[PDB]
UniProtKB/Swiss-Prot annotation, chain A:
Its main location: nucleus. GO terms for cellular component: cytoplasm; GID complex; nucleus; vacuole. InterPro entries: ARM-like, ARM-type_fold, ARMC8/Vid28. The gene is VID28. Identified in the GID/CTLH complex. In the absence of stress, the complex exists as an inactive anticipatory complex (GID(Ant)), composed of VID30/GID1, the E3 ubiquitin-ligase RMD5/GID2, VID28/GID5, GID8, and the RING-like subunit FYV10/GID9, awaiting a substrate receptor to form the active E3 ligase complex. When cells are shifted to glucose-containing medium, the substrate receptor VID24/GID4 is induced and becomes part of the complex, named GID(SR4). This is GID complex subunit 5. ARM repeats lie at residues 474-513, 534-575, 600-639, 653-689, 693-741. Component of the GID E3 ligase complex recruiting N termini and catalyzing ubiquitination of proteins targeted for degradation. GID E3 is regulated through assembly with interchangeable N-degron-binding substrate receptors induced by distinct environmental perturbations. Required for the adaptation to the presence of glucose in the growth medium; mediates in association with the substrate receptor VID24/GID4 the degradation of enzymes involved in gluconeogenesis when cells are shifted to glucose-containing medium. It comes from the Eukaryota.
Swiss-Prot record, chain B:
One of its GO terms (biological process) is ubiquitin-dependent protein catabolic process via the N-end rule pathway. The record marks Q43, E161, Y174 as: Interaction with the N-terminal Pro (Pro/N-degron) of proteins that are targeted for degradation. The gene is VID24. This is GID complex substrate-recognition subunit 4. It comes from Saccharomyces cerevisiae (strain ATCC 204508 / S288c) (Baker's yeast). Induction: Rapidly induced by a shift to glucose-containing medium.
Swiss-Prot record, chain C:
InterPro entries: CRA_dom (IPR013144), CTLH/CRA (IPR024964), CTLH_C (IPR006595), Ubq-SigPath_Reg (IPR050618). Component of the GID E3 ligase complex recruiting N termini and catalyzing ubiquitination of proteins targeted for degradation. GID E3 is regulated through assembly with interchangeable N-degron-binding substrate receptors induced by distinct environmental perturbations. Required for the adaptation to the presence of glucose in the growth medium; mediates in association with the substrate receptor VID24/GID4 the degradation of enzymes involved in gluconeogenesis when cells are shifted to glucose-containing medium. It comes from Saccharomyces cerevisiae (strain ATCC 204508 / S288c). Identified in the GID/CTLH complex. In the absence of stress, the complex exists as an inactive anticipatory complex (GID(Ant)), composed of VID30/GID1, the E3 ubiquitin-ligase RMD5/GID2, VID28/GID5, GID8, and the RING-like subunit FYV10/GID9, awaiting a substrate receptor to form the active E3 ligase complex. When cells are shifted to glucose-containing medium, the substrate receptor VID24/GID4 is induced and becomes part of the complex, named GID(SR4). Belongs to the GID8 family. This is GID complex subunit 8. It holds the Pfam family CTLH. GO terms for biological process: negative regulation of gluconeogenesis; proteasome-mediated ubiquitin-dependent protein catabolic process; traversing start control point of mitotic cell cycle. Its main location: nucleus. The keyword Nucleus applies. It is found in: Nucleus; Cytoplasm. Residues 30-62 form the LisH domain. GO terms for cellular component: cytoplasm; GID complex; nucleus. Keywords: Cell cycle, Cytoplasm, Nucleus, Ubl conjugation pathway.
């Protein structure tokens, strides 16, 4: 508990002795921690090093010994985070003191990652100054080199709390929020990392060698569509390898946020350097090369149509599955699944990754591994996670290919496991709701709103994604997925998750986010069974899906236009952070599908249960998906009905002004906003096709005709707004056709359409590039010519 | 006053966003191949005529490369003579990787029901004046020069019946040609141990002035 | 008692040797690469006097400053002292020397072997009447039990040692003295492998004239040992898909985690259960060469090749005259 010599004696005694280490955590010997945790200036370099060494040795326990020790271990860890001040004097400490301190910090961050660490900025400034003064100028020591390596590891461990935008693409890489006071230091950090990378990697560039043939010498670098990558580049220096790997990973984190030209990622020699690094002997180097080469596909535009680079990188990504010690920051499952989803969602009907994997026998191996994982006799957490990953990747296979849908459904034992998973989750939820009061009473005193999530959530989410992928085909919906058990399980999951949200909000936000996500996915999978020409629509309607949708849509949690009661302030505070937009979008999706190609009897039943004000509560929702689904639901509702059109007119008349403002302000380059625009135009069609009164009312408005003219004047060269879109052109032509079709006011309307200048546009569209627009325009012109006599 | 205008707080922007994903979704339809169009007509077997009715359910024709094996059309077909209704799927001929002669197709279980010998395909296609005017070792050479099969008057396709629609089918298939400007369907049935060159010809039937849609999640 | 497949006379074998004797000289009847192999052997075996004289002769040492820098760089005296202390049966002092000189990271499964050899040394020192057995049972329970628990081979080794203590034929094997030398050699090799990166850094950063005796330039050494396996996700299978053979739910075929709570503030990733693929793939080749080939003396492995080649030629009935002297 004193006496540097005695400190070293205790260290020598303790090295490797878990029993003795545990013995120093009990009543009489705890006094040593009051001396270890108090390191102040002017103690002495040797004494500080001895204290840090002894403290690191003492804290180096296994989990089955931390269980014996208890919460005193974590009190000591928190004391190290809080009541120590070696980070404030990082620039004045000694090198060995800094190294030992950072090593202890890595141990603490590994054993207790939730405790808040308050001195990250001091460490970042120390790293920046150390790199800028010592490392780059070559006047550095072994202690400083190992210190900067440990600092790079510590910086890589940070969770980093990136931003959340609900309107961004769901399959691109998420980036981190940045302010100005942090922006200056971020720029400095990125500059330091880039300088380290350049300095270390500029010693091996002369090792790049490639011989190739161009079909129509050196010092030209003409064309690189070869599929052959340069010879291997090997870094013999181990410290250089560690620095290059860690610095390049952190630079990946930092480099798309720094403005500039002639970036390192867009270089011509560095890309070949990394391609050669793909063949290295060091697994860290290989994985970092994979990350660096695959990032642009998710963080860049138009990069996805560069399939030659993918075709030359894929063999090594497939090889990376087989190496035993993999780093913690590399998951080949996630990388492969991300690529497959990228191509599934940008260009369907053509998946380069799937064709490359299918021609070279890899998909069959993956499916064999999936079956073997499902068939194991004993499972644990590792096997459950591996099975979850396999289910996700198989869902990504089957998402957009009937070939793989039928191939996976030819197993006859897969739906059994799907139903087993759903049943197990339902059982867990029922038990939790039954024990709610006792669980609250027991865990309310310290675990107020911090409770772990149910362990089965990832498994059941993967099963629900797979089902959502299967249910996308009519052959499956009518032959093999025609089981009432699946519909029962989906409805039960919806009901149970909503009840859990209503009653068990005391469990916090970690417990409830997976339940909200499961609710979203199960709605997304129900909205396929609900569509017409599917045998389970009657089952879903008999078993009350509209009632569940109504409960979910009148809730103040999902519907912001509703006010919280006075008993629900606790719920308001507890659940305020969770984002719920997928749930709303999919609820409106289901309603839209229920209203497809139905009669006014069904329409009036749904409007009796869910009124029209409730549907209009979402018309101005900040999320684009909710707006799009509301507009498409309005289209399906107004389709072939005069009563509902009158109701919608009564709810507003400035309806045409509202639609004109929406049409002018929406951005046609967004998929959801373009869907909303199509919905608006076809609402106009369905409104015009009702009566002579409605035809007159639509022709009176001038903004509508201005928008129609602006859409119809677009051509191949003039494509600034609306993108010269055949769907919008056909919608406008349909509006005009309904205005002219069905006999005195019709001729006046024709004359008005001629004077406004739409006759010229219809005659101009006869020479279009799309046959549908050409034929519709010529028929409309013929009818106008007939009525113009 | 004007509630839905004064209360508009949706965030409107105008800048070129993250990657433009609005296009390349090749869900192309046709004026007469919409997902709700109806056709009626007759099928002539020997010297007897039966009434037939076709209702289209889904349609998604590819505008570009298409390595996927999802059906291009789908619908219900009802034949009277009692009434037999069957669910059918259809693949369109787009001159690349889905050419005329059945050799050029893939070797997949999905595509193995639409297949016959190239000589049979020739002697069955040659009865269409559209096929004749559009022009077995010469078609393979001259088909590669054709472009933009969707921007043409006639579209050729193959129809195959999978099962019966009320609580799920004869094992032949139809050669079909569709006229894009008048919406006429003309086809021939083929099976190995069947009759020869059974007729089929349909006209649009055509509500039908207002639109309503769906979309698979 | 005849060769048959081939039989070389002395002149024929001399012709065979002379056919390729030039390759060894042009890659660098004379072997020019022998002095460097000798210096590598002397340094890696911690032979200090011969090491210094050989370095002087090769030309890497010019004065006492050079001698001191060489000894400091390669830790020859420290490694020799530790090896001697192990060879004298004083293992507590050897471990104290290791911890004080190289650091607390070297010993934190050679430590288990050192503890076992210390127990055997105490047994031998007493033998050269029950309370003694009780004290050694307490020592074994305090130090060796938990280390040996995470294996079965260590269990059998403790069982052997405890039988040996109980006695008043592997027992006469472990009671011998060759085990001391074997463990000393293992410790020396591990110390070289541990201090190699520092030597690389001092040779590169500081523009030193002393050579990297390990790892001739145009090769690679990796400090990490990895295992590659073909029979996993790859294309080496057929085009055949195996089907599910289990009709029992996964939740019937199934803790070690601790739920902790927070006390802006920085949080870190939770690395709990992030090697699931590596723990599961073995339910469904390695870099020996570059990883751990170069950490032995080179002459030892050349001699192993020589013996293996001789025995293989004999096994295949080819007659070659062995080396004389």
């Amino acid at each position: 508990a004193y006496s540097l010599e005695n400190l070293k004696k205790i260290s020598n005694s303790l090295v490797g002795d878990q029993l003795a280490k545990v013995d120093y955590f009990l009543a009489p010997k705890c006094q040593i921690f009051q001396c270890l945790l108090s390191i102040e200036q002017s103690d002495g370099v040797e004494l500080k090093n001895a204290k840090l060494d002894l403290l690191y040795t003492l804290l180096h326990l296994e989990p089955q010994q931390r269980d014996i020790v208890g919460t005193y271990y974590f009190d000591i860890v928190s004391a190290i985070y809080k009541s120590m001040s070696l980070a404030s004097s990082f620039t004045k400490n000694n090198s060995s003191t800094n190294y030992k301190y950072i090593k202890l910090l890595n141990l603490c961050a590994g054993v207790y990652p939730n405790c808040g660490f308050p001195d990250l900025q001091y460490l970042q400034n120390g790293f920046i100054q150390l790199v800028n003064h010592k490392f780059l100028r070559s006047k550095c020591k072994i202690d400083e080199v190992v210190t900067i390596i440990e600092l790079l590891k510590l910086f890589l461990l940070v969770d980093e709390k990136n931003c959340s935008d609900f309107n961004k693409s769901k399959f691109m890489e998420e980036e981190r929020e940045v302010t100005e006071t942090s922006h200056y230091q971020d720029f400095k950090m990125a500059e330091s990392l880039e300088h380290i990378i350049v300095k270390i990697s500029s010693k091996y560039l002369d090792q790049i060698s490639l011989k190739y043939i161009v079909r129509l010498p050196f010092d030209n670098k003409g064309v690189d569509c070869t599929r052959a990558i340069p010879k291997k580049i090997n870094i013999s220096n181990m410290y250089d390898s560690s620095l290059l790997s860690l610095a390049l990973l952190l630079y990946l984190r930092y480099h798309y946020m720094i403005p500039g030209d002639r970036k390192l990622r867009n270089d011509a020699t560095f890309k070949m350097f990394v391609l050669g690094l793909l063949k290295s002997n060091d697994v860290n180097i290989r994985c970092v090369a994979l990350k660096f080469l695959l990032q642009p596909y998710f963080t860049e535009d138009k990069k996805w149509e560069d399939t030659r680079t993918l075709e030359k990188i894929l063999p090594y990504l497939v090889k990376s599955f087989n190496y035993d010690p993999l780093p913690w920051w590399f998951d080949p499952f996630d990388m492969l699944d991300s690529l497959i989803v990228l191509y599934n969602e940008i260009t369907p009907m053509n998946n380069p990754v799937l064709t490359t994997l299918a021609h070279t026998n890899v998909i069959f191996c993956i499916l064999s591994r999936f079956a073997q994982c499902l068939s194991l006799p004993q499972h644990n957490e590792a096997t459950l996670k591996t099975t979850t990953k396999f289910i996700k990747i198989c869902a990504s296979f089957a998402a957009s290919d009937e070939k793989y849908r039928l191939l996976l459904l030819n197993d006859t034992l897969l739906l059994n496991h799907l139903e087993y998973g759903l049943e197990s989750h339902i059982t867990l939820i029922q038990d939790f709701i039954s024990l709610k009061d006792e669980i609250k009473e027991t865990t309310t005193e310290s675990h107020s709103m911090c409770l772990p999530p149910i362990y089965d959530h990832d498994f059941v989410a993967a099963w629900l994604l797979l089902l959502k992928s299967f249910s996308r085909s009519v052959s499956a919906l009518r032959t093999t997925l025609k089981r009432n058990k699946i519909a029962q399980l989906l409805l039960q999951i919806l009901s149970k998750t909503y009840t859990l949200t209503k009653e068990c909000y005391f469990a916090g936000q970690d417990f409830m986010k997976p339940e909200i996500m499961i609710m979203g996915i199960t709605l997304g999978s129900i909205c396929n069974f609900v569509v017409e020409f599917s045998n389970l629509q009657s089952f879903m309607l008999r078993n009350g899906i509209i009632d569940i949708i109504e409960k979910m849509l009148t809730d103040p949690l999902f519907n912001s236009k509703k006010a919280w009661d006075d008993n629900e302030d606790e719920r308001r505070i507890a659940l305020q952070g969770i984002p719920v937009h997928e749930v709303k979008a999919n609820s409106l999706w289901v309603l839209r599908h229920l209203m497809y190609n139905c009669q006014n009897e069904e329409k009036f039943q749904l409007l009796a249960k869910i009124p029209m004000n409730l549907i209009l509560d979402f018309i101005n929702d900040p999320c684009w998906a909710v707006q799009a689904q509301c507009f498409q639901l309005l289209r399906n509702l107004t389709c072939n009905s005069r009563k509902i059109v009158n109701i919608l007119l009564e709810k507003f008349t400035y309806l045409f002004e509202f639609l004109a403002k929406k049409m002018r302000l929406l951005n046609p380059l967004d998929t959801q906003q373009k869907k909303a625009m199509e919905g608006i135009l076809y609402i106009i069609v369905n409104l015009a096709a009702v009566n002579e009164n409605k035809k007159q009312l639509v022709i009176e408005q001038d903004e509508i005709l201005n928008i129609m003219s602006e859409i119809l004047v677009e051509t191949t060269t003039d494509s600034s707004s609306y993108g010269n879109d055949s769907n919008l052109k056909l919608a406008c032509l349909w509006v005009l056709n309904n205005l002219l079709w069905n006999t005195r006011a019709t001729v006046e309307r024709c004359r008005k359409l001629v004077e406004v200048g739409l006759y010229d546009l219809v005659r101009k569209n006869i020479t279009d590039e799309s046959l549908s627009v050409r034929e519709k325009a010529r028929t409309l012109l013929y009818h106008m010519d007939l009525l113009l006599k | 006053r004007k509630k839905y205008i004064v209360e508009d707080q949706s965030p409107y922007s105008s800048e070129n966003p993250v990657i433009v994903t609005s296009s390349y979704n090749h869900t192309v339809c046709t004026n007469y191949l919409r997902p709700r169009m109806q056709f009626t007509g007759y099928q002539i077997s020997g010297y007897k005529r039966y009434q037939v009715t076709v209702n289209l359910k889904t349609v998604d024709l590819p505008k570009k490369d298409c390595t996927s094996l999802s059906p291009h059309l789908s619908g219900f077909l009802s034949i009277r003579g009692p009434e037999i209704s069957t669910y059918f799927e259809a693949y369109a001929v787009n001159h690349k990787e889905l050419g005329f002669l059945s050799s050029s197709w893939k070797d997949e279980p999905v595509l193995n029901e639409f297949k016959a010998t190239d000589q049979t395909d020739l002697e069955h296609w040659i009865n269409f004046p559209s096929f004749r005017q559009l022009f077995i070792s010469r078609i393979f050479s001259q088909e590669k020069q054709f472009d933009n099969y969707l921007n043409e008057r006639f579209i050729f396709m193959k129809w195959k019946e999978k099962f019966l629609v009320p609580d799920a089918s004869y094992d032949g298939f139809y050669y079909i040609v569709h006229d894009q400007v008048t919406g006429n369907i003309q086809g021939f049935y083929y099976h190995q141990d069947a009759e020869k060159f059974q007729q089929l010809e349909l006209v649009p039937s055509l509500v039908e002035s207002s639109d309503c849609s769906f979309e698979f999640a | 008692f005849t060769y048959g497949k081939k039989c070389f006379t002395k002149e024929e074998w001399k012709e065979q040797v002379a056919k390729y004797s030039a390759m060894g000289e042009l890659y660098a009847p004379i072997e020019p690469t022998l002095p460097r192999l000798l210096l590598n052997y002397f340094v890696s075996m911690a032979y200090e006097d011969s090491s210094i004289r050989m370095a002087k002769e090769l030309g890497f040492i010019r004065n006492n400053k050079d001698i001191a820098v060489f000894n400091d760089l390669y830790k020859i005296k420290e490694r020799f002292h530790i090896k001697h202390l192990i060879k004298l049966g004083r293992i507590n002092e050897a471990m104290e020397e290791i911890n004080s000189i190289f650091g607390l990271e070297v010993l934190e499964d050679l430590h288990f072997k050192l503890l076992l050899l210390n127990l055997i040394e105490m047994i031998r020192s007493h033998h050269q009447s029950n309370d003694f057995i009780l004290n050694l049972i307490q020592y074994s329970q305090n130090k060796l039990a938990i280390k040996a628990s995470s294996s079965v081979k260590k269990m059998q080794e403790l069982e052997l040692a405890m039988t040996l203590l109980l006695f008043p034929k592997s027992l006469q094997n472990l009671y011998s003295i060759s085990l001391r030398s074997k463990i000393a050699d293992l410790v020396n090799e591990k110390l070289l492998k541990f201090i190699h990166p520092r030597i690389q850094f001092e040779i590169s950063n500081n523009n030193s004239k002393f050579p990297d005796l390990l790892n001739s330039d145009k090769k690679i050494i990796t400090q990490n040992f990895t295992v590659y396996n073909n029979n996993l996700v790859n294309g080496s299978n057929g085009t055949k898909i195996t089907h599910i053979s289990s009709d029992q739910p996964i939740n019937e075929k199934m803790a070690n985690s601790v739920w902790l709570n927070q006390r802006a503030a920085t949080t870190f990733h939770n690395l709990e259960n992030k090697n699931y693929w590596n723990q599961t793939s073995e339910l469904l080749f390695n870099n020996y060469y570059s990883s751990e080939f170069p950490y032995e003396p080179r002459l030892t492995q050349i001699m192993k090749l020589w013996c293996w080649c001789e025995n293989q030629l004999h096994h295949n009935q080819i007659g070659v005259p062995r080396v004389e002297n």
